Design a protein around this ligand. Structure first.
Ligand SMILES: [Mg+2]
Ligand SMILES: [Mg+2]
Lengths: 143, 142
């Protein structure tokens, strides 16, 4: 009986989409998506553990966690999401989001949490969560 | 300065979809979609006005609000959702869900509420909400 959890995505979900999508160097200035961010705070107060998962590459070759650290600072200090765990696509991983996010899920999250719900904006990712038996709410079209 | 509201759909959203659509008298025995129903309680507690909107025809030719009243009772008594307003397809309206729900929005919801969010399951409707500038979360495939 693992503690109950909710997974949130970052891009398009917690954070709005102002810059280039793969231009992570400017991602520290992203704008919060208010209802989704409020949702994460709501779930945390209700005793769900919040887990953040992003397809953002963690960094560059010379700085492998550069973007992970930027993302984390944005989530924690700008959005104020009270997460207990953050997971990203490792530097050099070029597979599709749904493939990576599924791997992250089975390897790092599922053994520790009982994930009741995932929040995301991309159809391919949304269908993956649903397919492996995780309720998922799509919060935007994803285009 | 209107009160903030969240719109919830009923079929496939608040209620799981053992019964057929348009068989609305076996409708009283629907089972809750728990994460969504819990959401509506949370929002209500956080001071949002809960507005339930549904494509279900409101009743029969003989009784124009028979189905409306059945839906209302399930939402209030079984789901436990503290709603403030309920809007459905009028008896004998045969237009599409998204045309009906949009007309409901302009005439009965938008004048009284600042709608911050709509929760729904059907793609055609979800697209309508986003198209008219209302954030919408799609909680299952449609
Ligand atoms: Mg995203
Ligand atoms: Mg529906």
């Amino acid at each position: 009986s693992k503690p109950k959890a909710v997974i949130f995505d970052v891009d398009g979900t917690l954070a709005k989409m102002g810059r280039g999508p793969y231009d992570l160097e400017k991602c520290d200035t992203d704008v919060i998506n208010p209802m989704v961010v409020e949702l994460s705070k709501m779930y945390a107060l209700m005793g769900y553990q919040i887990v953040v998962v992003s397809g953002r590459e963690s960094g560059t070759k010379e700085d492998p966690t550069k973007y992970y650290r930027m993302t984390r600072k944005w989530v924690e200090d700008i959005a104020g999401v009270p997460l207990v765990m953050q997971c990203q696509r490792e530097q050099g991983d070029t597979r599709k989001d749904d493939v990576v996010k599924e791997e992250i899920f089975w390897k790092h999250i599922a053994p520790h949490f009982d994930v009741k719900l995932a929040i995301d904006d991309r159809t391919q990712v949304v269908e993956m969560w649903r397919r492996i038996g995780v309720e998922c709410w799509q919060v935007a079209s994803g285009d």
